[PDB]
Amino acid sequence: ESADLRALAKHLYDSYIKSFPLTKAKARAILTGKTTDKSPFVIYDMNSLMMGEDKIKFKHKEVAIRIFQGCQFRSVEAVQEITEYAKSIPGFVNLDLNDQVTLLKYGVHEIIYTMLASLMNKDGVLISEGQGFMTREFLKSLRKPFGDFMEPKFEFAVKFNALELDDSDLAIFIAVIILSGDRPGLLNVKPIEDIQDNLLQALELQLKLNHPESSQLFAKLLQKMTDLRQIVTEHVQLLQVIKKTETDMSLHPLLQEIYKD
Amino acid sequence: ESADLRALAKHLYDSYIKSFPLTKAKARAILTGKTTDKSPFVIYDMNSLMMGEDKIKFKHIKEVAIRIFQGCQFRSVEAVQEITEYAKSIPGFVNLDLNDQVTLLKYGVHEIIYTMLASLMNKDGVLISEGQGFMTREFLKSLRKPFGDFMEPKFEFAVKFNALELDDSDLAIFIAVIILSGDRPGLLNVKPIEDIQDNLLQALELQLKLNHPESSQLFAKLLQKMTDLRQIVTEHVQLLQVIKKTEPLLQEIYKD
Ligand SMILES: O=C(Nc1ccc(Oc2ncccn2)cc1C(=O)O)c1ccc(Cl)cc1Cl
Ligand SMILES: O=C(Nc1ccc(Oc2ncccn2)cc1C(=O)O)c1ccc(Cl)cc1Cl
Ligand SMILES: *c1ccc([N+](=O)[O-])cc1C(=O)Nc1ccccc1
Ligand SMILES: *c1ccc([N+](=O)[O-])cc1C(=O)Nc1ccccc1
């Protein structure tokens, strides 16, 4: 009955709020720029990067690397948050532990880039809890491996943000990503498949209710999962170019755990 | 109003049953209750464990005590989500500030676990794996220096707590009280968080008197037990970083 699926939506949207500080709704508020309750310092060249540390604090050496390093701890941080949100999906913690770990190992990137879109517009991305902004151009212009590491995310975000999803939608969508069943190494696909079937049932109703005039947003949404599986693959292989380019520069082990390609 | 308290009572009961798979009535039929319509595989020594791992379906597929500890970590993660779901049914819990909600859960979840662990225990040992198992108290004590003493003070508590002879309709209101505790560090608006508790304490108060007619002053006895929950949780939170001195994606699963 629709009555139940509305509850799973409200439930996930509540957990989504509690697991991620920077929601899409908050992100867009910062990004309009008409909302100046706090506006972001914009990094666009090396001289903004200088200032970008004067007054923006982050949790603390070529620029292109130290950017990446700070980009990397954010990744760790988002993995922590997704992990906290996953644990809230009804029945996730009831699944086999090997498969909990396997659903995370694989869904985390697809979620990371889904949510990165909330932080992006055609010109850049909010940094450091929104305190910052960093241009698509300043990113596209770092040292040669690093000068398009982050470019395709931007093209996906633009095409993905075209869906105009809000947070209540994302929360259900984020769930479906976690509970795929298509993941390699899964011990028990069918219980995963049953939760995901509920979650899709939840998504469909939500999308048709939250965006009434937007027909086949459910189908066009699900189809966006194609674009995701392809970002994830460009990323790992680009990341391997850096493990060889940068034998001196290390990689956070939690991230490493989720990269046995 | 007599009837409003009893109303919230049945609300909470109905919700606790739906949120908690293994209810105390259930647990007690299995346990010392000779309700041998089904029986749990029992773990009394090392030989029975490997037997039991092989028959029972543990959802966490490495030495003896460590494997037990992790399977314990797995159960608590599920319990948490049962507590969490249960909470959303407490009247007014959801109307709270979400930060406050997260705080009550954060600090209330251990006390609630060890409260409901009591329902799965007796002096001789404890039910495990949805009650498909029973792990004797002596086999648990018979674990390696870090691990044998982990579980003795819980068995300590359950015996005293179970002596109250509380049932699931009592534990319903009681755990609601525990959660809507307005003395948790960091809450932002303790008025509802205490307004509901004064409602909850009223309900529990009447409930105990009606279900336990001449258990004089059980309510008080049951509240002063709440000093024993805080005390254990403290000894438990302590005993979780003496083990981290011994012991990555699953580490982020179990961030305590
Ligand atoms: O830069 C990014 N993230 C961060 C990088 C550094 C950082 O700390 C920092 N900032 C500037 C310079 C050095 N370090 C914080 C973040 C963040 O997103 O939270 C980033 C975000 C999205 C995309 Cl698509 C690309 C990047 Cl390179
Ligand atoms: O056994 C307990 N928890 C579990 C530990 C392991 C486990 O899975 C398991 N069993 C045996 C060996 C290894 N792992 C399941 C449970 C459970 O409570 O459901 C337990 C329950 C109460 C108390 Cl006071 C102590 C423990 Cl150790
Ligand atoms: C940036 C640089 C390196 C990695 N990595 O090696 O995994 C990841 C990222 C990245 O995309 N970080 C991120 C995720 C989410 C939000 C902001 C930044
Ligand atoms: C067992 C081991 C570790 C923790 N911990 O990390 O805080 C907790 C527990 C525990 O008490 N598990 C449990 C809860 C509820 C029912 C059965 C078992």
Numbering used by the authors:
A (entry chain A): 207 to 266, 275 to 475
B (entry chain B): 207 to 267, 275 to 460, 467 to 475
Task: Reproduce the article's own wording on this structure.
Peroxisome proliferator-activated receptor γ (PPARγ) is a ligand-regulated nuclear receptor transcription factor that regulates gene expression programs controlling adipogenesis and insulin sensitization. Endogenous PPARγ ligands, which include lipids and fatty acids, bind to an orthosteric pocket within the PPARγ ligand-binding domain (LBD) and function as PPARγ agonists that activate gene programs. GW9662 and T0070907 are covalent ligands originally described as antagonists as they bind via a nucleophilic substitution mechanism to Cys285 located within the orthosteric pocket and were shown to inhibit binding of select reference PPARγ agonists. However, we previously showed GW9662 and T0070907 do not block all ligands from binding to PPARγ — and moreover, they have distinct pharmacological PPARγ functions as a transcriptionally neutral antagonist (GW9662) and repressive inverse agonist (T0070907).
To visualize the ligand cobinding poses, we first crystalized complexes of PPARγ LBD covalently bound to GW9662 or T0070907, which produced solvent exposed active (chain A) and inactive (chain B) helix 12 conformations similar to apo-PPARγ LBD, then we added synthetic ligands to the crystals using soaking methods. The BVT.13 cobinding pose is similar to its orthosteric binding pose located near the β-sheet. However, the 2,4-dichloro group clashes with the orthosteric GW9662 and T0070907 binding poses, specifically the phenyl and pyridyl groups respectively, resulting in a slight reorientation of the 2,4-dichloro group to accommodate the cobound state. For BVT.13, the covalent ligand cobinding pose is similar to the orthosteric binding pose. Each of the non-covalent synthetic ligands utilizes unique mechanisms to cobind with the covalent ligands, as inferred from our crystal structures in which pre-formed crystals of the PPARγ LBD were soaked with non-covalent synthetic ligands BVT.13 cobinds to a region of the orthosteric pocket that only slightly overlaps with the orthosteric covalent ligand binding pose, adopting a cobinding pose that is similar to when soaked into apo-PPARγ LBD crystals. MRL24 and nTZDa, which are the most potent non-covalent ligands tested, pushed the covalent ligands into different non-natural conformations, whereas BVT.13 and SR1664 do not.
